[PDB]
Amino acid sequence: KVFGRCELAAAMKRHGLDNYRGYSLGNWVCAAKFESNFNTQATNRNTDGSTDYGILQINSRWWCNDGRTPGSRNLCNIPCSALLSSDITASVNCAKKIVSDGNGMNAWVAWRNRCKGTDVQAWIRGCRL
Ligand SMILES: [Cl-]
Ligand SMILES: [Cl-]
Ligand code: NA
């Protein structure tokens, strides 16, 4: 599914991401925009043979099992395909664990390079929440 900006803001808010570990909602919406363009079916292969999955491009080397990344962990205890559902719950619950692990949202390269230090508020501007 391809969310709209405010639709996705509202789903993330309902799932408890607004202010999670001190990151306001605009941060999570900006990151989804630049990681997946709000498309829950996005996949992308990395140089090391791992793959990133879903609206927040979560990586199979650590976080989910796709049966094809030798020597990887599955720290969110899910198959990676669960992260491509039109229901973002699986992605959000795994992201909360990632963002809790010490390095915050710097885990998301596109957040670091395209959202960090910008007016992330703008991403929720105009939405009724
Ligand atoms: Cl915000
Ligand atoms: Cl932090
Ligand atoms: Na894995």
101 labelled as ligand-binding?
A: yes
| Nearest ligand (C-alpha, residue 118) | 1
- Cite the active site residues: 35, 52
Outline where DSSP puts E strands in 1-129.
43-45, 51-53, 58-59
Residues surrounding ion ligand 2 at CB below 5 Å:
104
User: What domains does the chain contain, in order, with CATH numbers?
Assistant: 1-129 (1.10.530.10)
| Nearest ligand (C-alpha, residue 105) | 2
CA pair distance 70, 100, nearest whole angstrom? 25
CA pair distance 29, 65, nearest whole angstrom? 25
Resolution in A for the shown PDB structure? 1.9
Question: Among residues 30, 127, 51, 41, which one has the least CA distance to residue 91?
Answer: 41
98 contact partners, CB below 8 Å, separation of at least 6: 58, 63, 107
For the chain, after which residues does the C atom lie more than 2.5 Å from the next written residue's N, i.e. where is it broken?
none
